[PDB]
Structure 1
Amino acid sequence: SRLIFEHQRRLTPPTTRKGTITIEPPPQLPRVVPPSLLRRVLPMRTEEVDAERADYLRYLSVVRDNVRAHAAEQRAALEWSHPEPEVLATIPGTRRQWERDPRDRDFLVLRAGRHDVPLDAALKVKDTADEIDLEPVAHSALRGLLDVQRTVRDAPTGLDVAKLARITVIGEADEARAAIRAWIAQAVTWHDPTMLGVALAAPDLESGDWSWLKWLPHVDVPNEADGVGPARYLTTSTAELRERLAPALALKHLLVVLDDPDADPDDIARLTGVTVIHRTTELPNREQYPDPERPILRVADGRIERWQVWQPCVDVADAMSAAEAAHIARRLSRWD
């Protein structure tokens, strides 16, 4: 039926030099004496302080070059590990489909879109003086460098679903399913069937919607035939999905999406690695200072906004269509 995969080792992207870049502080605003014109009509004046300003701005150009190199390496790694959701149809044929080991620093981390990754380099000045007033053009340039270069521009972020354990999206009826489909295709493209599996609860499941999980080899269990599909975790009842999952849930990771806002959401947990996905109708208004794990996400036209007391967290969303993910799963089903 299926073909065979051989787990060749992952290629290595050019890693980010995660260090501590230090900038020397600006000079100390030296008091120029007014030139005392009797020694000015004859031809520490302004020339020495201007030459020292030019020296500091040369040094600031050098450290701006270094910071831009760090940001280029970071965006190169993030574009190697999270491609735009059209490239990953060409992935599952070549030697880079089941590539993300749990030892690599990207594992069970999913692309939601492109926004401002905060530049994991340090950018720490060694300002040690006790509020000595700085030079008004050197310190202005350093303050202009530490605020627009410390945030990388629109770069592929990560919805790390190894440490959230509940992805309860809210929003529209099918526009939330776009983002769910997008990062669930991102999940099933990069990681092995034996390293994670995927499960579904849905009322109208085999109807041109979520039926594209028909071909996913991650919906399997070991040693059960069930006619055509191996296990077919996609069902219509969440409790029947749980008893379908009860030997599988007691580490092979899991990703359980639910389509019903009602019909006992989160009746599986509350587990110890199983992370569930849910779509709810409407928001909580006064959630009690929400945890770093289990967040709230509302899908706008192109924004995936988080809940923090609106902290949009994605500037442009990644929205996969239905037949696109159908083609991803159809190319994926050949290999195992």
Structure 2
Amino acid sequence: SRLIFEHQRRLTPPTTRKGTITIEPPPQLPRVVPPSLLRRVLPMRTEEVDAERADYLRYLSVVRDNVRAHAAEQRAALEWSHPEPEVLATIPGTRRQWERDPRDRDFLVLRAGRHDVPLDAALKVKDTADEIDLEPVAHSALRGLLDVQRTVRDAPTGLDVAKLARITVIGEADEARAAIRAWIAQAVTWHDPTMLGVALAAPDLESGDWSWLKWLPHVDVPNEADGVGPARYLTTSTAELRERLAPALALKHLLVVLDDPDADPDDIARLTGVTVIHRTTELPNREQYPDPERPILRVADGRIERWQVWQPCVDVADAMSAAEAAHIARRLSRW
């Protein structure tokens, strides 16, 4: 029925030299004596301090170039490991499909869009002064540097799921199912179908809606045919999906999604990593400062605005379409 895949090694994109770039503090406002016309009318004065200013600014330029190289490495890696939700149509073929392993820094991380990643490198200066006054035209430059070259511009974000255990989106219907299908495909595509599992419950499953999990062998079961479908956990009842997963519930990671806002949300959990996803109708208003785990997510036009006290947390969201996911499943069912 299906072909065979062999565990060819993963390729390595050049990682980050995650060190501690250090910057020398500027000079210390050298005291300038009065010009004194008497000894200035013949035809440690400004010339020397200007020379020193120029030297420090040159040094600063060099450091800026180096940190930009580091930023280039970082964006290169992050683009390599979370491509845009169209290239993934071509990935199921080549030797990079199950290229994610539990030893690798990117594991069970699900891309959702592009915004400012804070440049994991250090950027620490060794300031040792007790409010001594530093030269104005150097300190100004260093300060104006340490704020714009510290955060990478729009970069592939990460909605990691290895330490969330619950995701609950809020907002319009299909805008939600978009980001959901998006990162759920991005998840299944990179990791061995023998390593992580997914579950579904929805009323109109086979209508161009959640049907598309048909050809999915990530939703599979061990030792069961179900006639045509791998496991076809794809259902409409909640506790029924639980029972279909009750033996599978026990590490193969589990990803249970629920297109139903009602029908007893939070009824399996609340375990040790098995993640639940549930689209909700409406929000809490005074949540007790939601834990970074099991958080709240609102879907704007192109934002995925987190819930904190609105901290958009994504400025351009990654959205998928239904038919695209359909063609994804179709292509991937081959190997």
What TM-score range do you get, normalising by the shorter chain? over 0.9
The 1-side partners of 2:325 and 2:58 are apart by 51
User: Is 2:17 the partner of 1:17?
Assistant: yes
Partner of 2:48: 48
Q: Percent identity?
A: 100
Greater Cα shift, 103-112 or 194-203: 194-203
Deviation at 1:223, TM superposition (A): 0.7
CA displacement at 1:201 relative to structure 2:
1.1
Deviation at 1:227, TM superposition (A): 1.3
**Residue by residue, what CA displacement relative to the aligned partner does 1:169-207 show, whole Å, maximum 9, x if unpaired?**
111111011111111111011111011111111111111
Distance 1:304 1:56 in 2: 42
2:92 is paired with a residue of what secondary structure? helix
Partner of 1:178: 178
The alpha carbon displacement at 1:40 in A equals 1.7
Structure 1 residue 34: deviation in Å?
A: 2.4
Distance 1:258 1:29, change over 3 A: same
Deviation at 1:119, TM superposition (A): 0.3
What secondary structure is seen at the aligned counterpart in 1 of 2:254?
A: strand
1:4 aligns with 2:18: no
2:119 & 2:238 partners in 1: Cα distance?
Answer: 41
State the partner residue of 2:257.
257
- For residues 19-98 of structure 1, the aligned pairs below 5 Å read 19-98=19-98
Q: 1:276 to 1:40 in 2, by over 3 A?
A: same
Once residues 133 and 331 of structure 2 are traced to their aligned partners in structure 1, the CA distance between those partners, rounded to angstroms, is 64
Moved over 2 A (4+): none
Distance change >3 Å, CA 43–CA 210, structure 1 → 2: farther
* TM-score normalised by the chain length of structure 1: 0.98
Q: Does 1:117 align with 2:117?
A: yes
Secondary structure of the structure 2 residue equivalent to 1:93: coil
For 2:237 and 2:31, the matched residues in 1 are separated by 78
Deviates more, 1:29-38 or 1:309-318: 29-38
Pairwise CA distance, 1:230: 2.1
TM-score by structure 2 length?
A: 0.99
Distance 1:236 1:83 in 2: 32
- Structure 1 residue 296: Cα displacement: 0.6
* 1:44 Cα deviation after fit: 1.2
- Mapped to 1, the partners of 2:237 and 2:112 lie a distance apart of 28
Q: CA shift at 1:276, angstroms?
A: 0.9
- For residue 148 of structure 1, what is the aligned residue in structure 2? 148
1:225 deviates by: 1.4
- Count of residues paired in the alignment: 335
1:225-284 per-residue CA deviation (whole Å, 9 max, x = no partner) reads 111112111111111000010010111011111011110112110111101111001111
Q: Which segments of 5 or more consecutive residues in structure 2 lack a partner in the other structure?
A: none
Structure 2 CA distance for partners of 1:134 and 1:12, relative to 1, 3 Å: same
**Does structure 1 conserve the Cα–Cα contact (< 8 Å) formed by 2:215 and 2:230?**
no
Q: Deviations over 1:40-78 (max 9, x none)?
A: 221411111111111111110111011101100000000
**Secondary structure in 2 matching 1:65:** helix
Q: Distance in 2 between matches of 1:136 and 1:233?
A: 67
* Contact 2:97 2:191 survives alignment (8 Å): yes
Tell me, in whole angstroms, the C-alpha distance in 2 between the residues paired with 1:143 and 1:212: 52
Secondary structure, counterpart of 1:198 in structure 2:
strand
Name structure 1 gaps, 5 residues minimum.
none
**Aligned-residue RMSD, C-alpha:** 0.8
Secondary structure at 2:173 match in 1 = coil
| Partner Cα separation in structure 2 for residue 182 and residue 25 of structure 1 | 46
Q: Which whole-Å CA distance do the structure 1 matches of 2:94 and 2:161 have between them?
A: 25
CA distance in 2, matches of 1:54, 1:233: 68
Deviation digits for residues 7-66 of structure 1, max 9, x if unmatched? 111000100110100100111111112211222221411111111111111110111011
Q: Given that residues 115 and 155 in structure 2 are in contact (C-alpha distance below 8 angstroms), is that contact kept between their aligned partners in structure 1?
A: yes
